[PDB]
Design an enzyme around this catalytic site. Sequence first.
Site, short mmCIF file in Angstrom:
data_model
loop_
_atom_site.label_atom_id
_atom_site.label_comp_id
_atom_site.label_asym_id
_atom_site.label_seq_id
_atom_site.Cartn_x
_atom_site.Cartn_y
_atom_site.Cartn_z
CG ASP B 60 -1.98 1.07 1.21
OD1 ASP B 60 -1.76 2.14 0.63
OD2 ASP B 60 -3.05 0.86 1.83
CG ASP B 66 -0.71 8.30 5.63
OD1 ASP B 66 -0.52 9.35 4.96
OD2 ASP B 66 -1.86 7.84 5.88
CD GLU B 89 -4.13 9.22 12.38
OE1 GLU B 89 -3.13 9.16 11.63
OE2 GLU B 89 -5.10 8.42 12.32
CD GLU B 90 -0.20 7.96 10.36
OE1 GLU B 90 -0.41 6.73 10.26
OE2 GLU B 90 -0.85 8.83 9.73
CG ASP B 110 -2.84 13.44 10.83
OD1 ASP B 110 -2.09 12.50 10.48
OD2 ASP B 110 -3.94 13.65 10.29
CG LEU B 112 0.43 12.71 4.30
CD1 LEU B 112 0.99 14.14 4.01
CD2 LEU B 112 1.05 11.67 3.37
CG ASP B 113 -5.10 14.00 5.30
OD1 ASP B 113 -4.07 14.47 4.76
OD2 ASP B 113 -6.26 14.33 4.95
CD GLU B 272 -7.86 14.32 12.68
OE1 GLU B 272 -8.77 13.96 13.46
OE2 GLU B 272 -7.62 13.71 11.62
MG LIG Z 1 -2.57 10.24 9.59
#
Ligand SMILES: [Mg+2]
Lengths: 323, 327, 327, 320
Positions: B60, B66, B89-90, B110, B112-113, B272
């Site tokens: 992926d 990410d 976030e990861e 975060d 990257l989203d 966020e």
């Molecule tokens: Mg993220």
Amino acid sequence: DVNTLTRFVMEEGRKARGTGELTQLLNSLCTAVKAISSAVRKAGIAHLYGIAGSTDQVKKLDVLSNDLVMNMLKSSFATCVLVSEEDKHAIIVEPEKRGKYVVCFDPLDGSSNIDCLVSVGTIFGIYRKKSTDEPSEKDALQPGRNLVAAGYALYGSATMLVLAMDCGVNCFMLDPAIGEFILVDKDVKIKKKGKIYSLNEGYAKDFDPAVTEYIQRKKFPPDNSAPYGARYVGSMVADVHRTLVYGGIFLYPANKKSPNGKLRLLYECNPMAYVMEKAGGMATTGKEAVLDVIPTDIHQRAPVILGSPDDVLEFLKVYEKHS
Amino acid sequence: DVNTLTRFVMEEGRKARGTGELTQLLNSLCTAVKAISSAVRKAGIAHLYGIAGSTNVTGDQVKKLDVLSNDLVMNMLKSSFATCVLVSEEDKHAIIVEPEKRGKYVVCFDPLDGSSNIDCLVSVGTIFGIYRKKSTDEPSEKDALQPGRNLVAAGYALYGSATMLVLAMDCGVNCFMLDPAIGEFILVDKDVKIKKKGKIYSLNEGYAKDFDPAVTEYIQRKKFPPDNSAPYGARYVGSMVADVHRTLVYGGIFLYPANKKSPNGKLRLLYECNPMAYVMEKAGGMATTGKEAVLDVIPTDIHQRAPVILGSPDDVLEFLKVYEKHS
Amino acid sequence: DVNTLTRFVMEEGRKARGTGELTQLLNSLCTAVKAISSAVRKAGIAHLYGIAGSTNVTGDQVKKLDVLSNDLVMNMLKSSFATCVLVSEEDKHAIIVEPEKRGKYVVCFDPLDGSSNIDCLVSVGTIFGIYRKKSTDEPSEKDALQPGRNLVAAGYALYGSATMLVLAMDCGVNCFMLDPAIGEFILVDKDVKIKKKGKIYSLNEGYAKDFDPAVTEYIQRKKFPPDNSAPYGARYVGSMVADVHRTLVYGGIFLYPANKKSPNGKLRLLYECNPMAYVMEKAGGMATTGKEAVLDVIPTDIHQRAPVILGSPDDVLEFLKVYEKHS
Amino acid sequence: DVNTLTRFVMEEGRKARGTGELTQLLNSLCTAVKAISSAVRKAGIAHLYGIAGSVKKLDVLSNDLVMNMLKSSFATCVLVSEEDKHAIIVEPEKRGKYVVCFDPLDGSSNIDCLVSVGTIFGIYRKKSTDEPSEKDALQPGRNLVAAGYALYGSATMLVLAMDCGVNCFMLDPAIGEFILVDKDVKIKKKGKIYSLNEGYAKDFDPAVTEYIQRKKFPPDNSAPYGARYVGSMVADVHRTLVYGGIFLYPANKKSPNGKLRLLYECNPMAYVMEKAGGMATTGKEAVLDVIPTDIHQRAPVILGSPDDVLEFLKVYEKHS
Ligand SMILES: [Mg+2]
Ligand SMILES: Nc1ncnc2c1ncn2[C@@H]1O[C@H](COP(=O)(O)O)[C@@H](O)[C@H]1O
Ligand SMILES: Nc1ncnc2c1ncn2[C@@H]1O[C@H](COP(=O)(O)O)[C@@H](O)[C@H]1O
Ligand SMILES: Nc1ncnc2c1ncn2[C@@H]1O[C@H](COP(=O)(O)O)[C@@H](O)[C@H]1O
Ligand SMILES: Nc1ncnc2c1ncn2[C@@H]1O[C@H](COP(=O)(O)O)[C@@H](O)[C@H]1O
Ligand SMILES: [Mg+2]
Ligand SMILES: [Mg+2]
Ligand SMILES: [Mg+2]
């Protein structure tokens, strides 16, 4: 084997027994898209803000993007008529640079929302000139069914070029380290049915009752299946490409501020319909297939619903119920 | 006079008579953001597709992006010598910086989203909030359990048509454009303020069936204004950085509100909601959960959710009027 | 009218009524040169030095430039479907392309000449010569043993202050500047011609004790002109591509002659001397071994060395007269 | 642990307990050099050649970049450039206390052939309490606070010399960041390469002729030195730093006091050499000890590995 746009296009043209005129045209378009991408990503903006002592921004970028496409296509010696969203009249290539092709394009679509740095993009459609008359705007008034090639560049998180021809739809990613479009998805096909619908719902007051009903079924499925997710960037290239990649449906129907539609038939709807149909998707105005509309004016508008065939078919069933 | 992020940060640090630690943190974050932008724009992807005779693609790529972004931020922040606790976030747990490299700042981010948004090649973003460690206790996840009001700096990078960094501090909000020809963030919008009322609303209307009754009425009022003014426009990208940035630039309202099945919203408070609420308030906007200001929530878990409605103050107040009508 | 390498090569292919095979070869070479350029300028070096930690490096990334360069040129030419036999400075034996990928052309190349001292950031380069296959029989390394006279195309890329591709064919010599902002070679100098006589001489004078007596006399005339004319200036970068490009651009003479410890010089005939001699001749310059034109030597070994004296014609003629005097 | 130029410079400023002014100066030069590099590599040349239908020289643009970045740093008061006949005095509102002497694009002489070119800088602190003037730039190299160069070669490298030593940073073009790649650099004690324009052989002082003869026919009869002469000072000096050896631009008859300029070519390179454990001499004295009387005055220079420079001086002291 690694494949690049230049190699892919050269080999399709060898396979086509053509003279190299369309190859040179597509070659020139690639160069222009790479140069647009560079400027869109703001290469050199430091000089605009005085780094060397020297001191409408969104406007100038779409003017520049127009100039890059116009110049690259003119000097290709492959074109005779160019229609651009940025130009009121069709441009007639000077005689000593004329070739056989007509090109309709929007050099920077969704440009006017550059202030938010939303995705922007380029859309193009390529026709063989059909009449033997002296070139003029009439040569661009062909139905989309006559398209020889069409596609778009998305200047999004990365720069991608989607090129649709008789051989199918192929997607190329720009590697900015080397200025090459790398082939990354071959012979793309849209899924038969998706889970995402895309349209500006702020016009809900002006919506046709067919549209209102269809969208009601996506939010409140009568069979109590999962509701569709919603996405709307407001830039046609971003929204159509997401529909191509994930499936689903994109709508820009008529409303009372735009009773003929908002999008433009020649360099927005027709190229996207062509990519959709080559991908196994659908594109309708409601009344007919987009590709079958016979244009009468080069900047005329059309309503468009496009994407996964089961979703467009489902919309069209709701549409004839409201005959 | 041209201004760069590096010069701007250095001058604000001098005006503050700081020791230079926060300056080093922000320099480190800026380098990391330039590195993420380069990867997001797919530099070197030709090598992945065999240009030198090697490798298949495997797995992926969005997920790997990410993870790579997370490693860029983690490593630049660790090597800044300005941080002690990193909440991402990861990662399941807070990352505690090793003793030798510990500084005084706590960073929630975060990086990257990519994975959390099926939109493919449309925008992606990085969000960050910076806190000063409040206690002399050995560092732990508790040092990141601070209300958004305690933030010293916050902001985001948008990897869109161009790469932009928005930085909010006590001196206001400033917007910097990355010039990829030279790797400099150029100062392009100074001391930004949001307009008091906008004309755009942003939320996922696919969830309409699960809407709280007040969100239904508010949105219905944007699409069918009772005074027959013009309906608002709708935009929903699905990337919080993109949707929040448009709200900042053009005005309007962005909603990810609570509802029956998600009584605390879906978005995450520490990396966020809080950073975006801080950018909004420094821009003269508002950011509410419906019950209180986002920046006043005191967290108890580092991955805890919060409802968030934010944007132009007249729109947020109008939503709160409708929200209280249904209390 | 702007003109790019891609457009130039394509139109030339249409002119000469080709099947497009040479065109696909040259397109492939152009792409490899762009990737070599990007590596040489040290794109991604920050990952080698840990910007994302230790885990985020190794692939093409960790290879030395000479190896990466060989892999790039090798792979692009194989996948061009236009070649059958490849000769590189890097590989003892010629490479025979798999039958599924064979075209009619033979390519001799130096993937990264001057990488010798790539440590000191000296300009380095790529050199190439293209022959058509002559033989009735199965492709073998004897197909590459053709005199330089049989070349259909030759040239080099210089990775100096900027990256330039010099392409030499029947139509003459044309020079393309790489625009790194968009990854296109731009035609910047057309049908280039060397000046008749220059004012620079170029060789490694550190080995003067081993000089052939004819080279000793010709260098003395440069520094002590017997007619009280102005002495020549001296330049020796130590990278053949850079020294030959200066000779093409400014005129003069470049020498890597035979000495007594080196009977036939040091530079390699097939993929160093022959392409450079072909560029010089198409530009109205000259290139000799001392005894005959470089392009007339019939090679017996794909890695055989040849002495080379090249540059402005009046300067090579004066050398030859001094040389034949001592013979 | 990766390091960047920005982070290295800021950390040295913290250790010095400086006010931040010299750090802002050095940040400002770093940005200018990245922009020079971008233009030297010809980014945007497609527009020059008409890609969109429809021009400052490189040396002029480079001078403009350095001058404007230094002015806007608020860290400088006097700027001396090879491109300007007189010293530029910074207006009162933008004045700091540092004097910067620089060559914006050395070697651009022959950029037509795509040879390596470079930027060279030397930074002094202003001593006086009075109005800044051209005289403030007339200092011996010994007074330098910082010096170095950026080489635009096969890749772009910035070499920075300061009290703490010499450090080398590679420009990663993917991200626009200088990455520290060689730390606390020291030159080889003795090299195997000599660098000079032997086209002036007829004008060489007999010290130089005899020293060069020692290099081709060695007196201990070790192997002869190889020769390199790029013709760009930044490239030849950088190779000298990386591989050891010696570089000479001595007096000739069109340049009787040498061709290279003392304030912004010789002195910065002498200072890099000395901080790297090398040497730099006019032949009569250390470059860094020359007290200049003209901002564009020239000096002969012999620099490089200590054993090779001492060997030249031993030959020079013979013809004294
Ligand atoms: Mg993220
Ligand atoms: N590069 C190409 N890729 C796909 N189809 C091509 C290409 N070149 C030519 N063709 C086809 O051949 C026709 C004539 O080509 P041309 O001789 O280039 O005008 C075109 O109208 C296309 O239908
Ligand atoms: N570059 C900067 N920009 C804005 N505020 C700063 C900066 N550096 C320091 N400060 C302020 O000064 C405090 C202490 O600085 P420091 O000694 O760097 O931790 C910070 O927590 C901020 O409140
Ligand atoms: N792009 C080109 N430029 C110059 N000459 C070419 C080109 N393409 C083909 N030719 C000439 O035509 C011959 C046959 O071309 P091909 O069938 O492509 O191998 C070549 O060996 C060249 O002599
Ligand atoms: N970034 C730095 N790197 C090395 N030395 C510095 C730095 N900043 C200041 N210094 C030293 O401290 C002095 C005063 O600095 P400033 O207050 O910035 O003028 C300088 O002249 C240097 O000797
Ligand atoms: Mg437009
Ligand atoms: Mg070699
Ligand atoms: Mg100079």
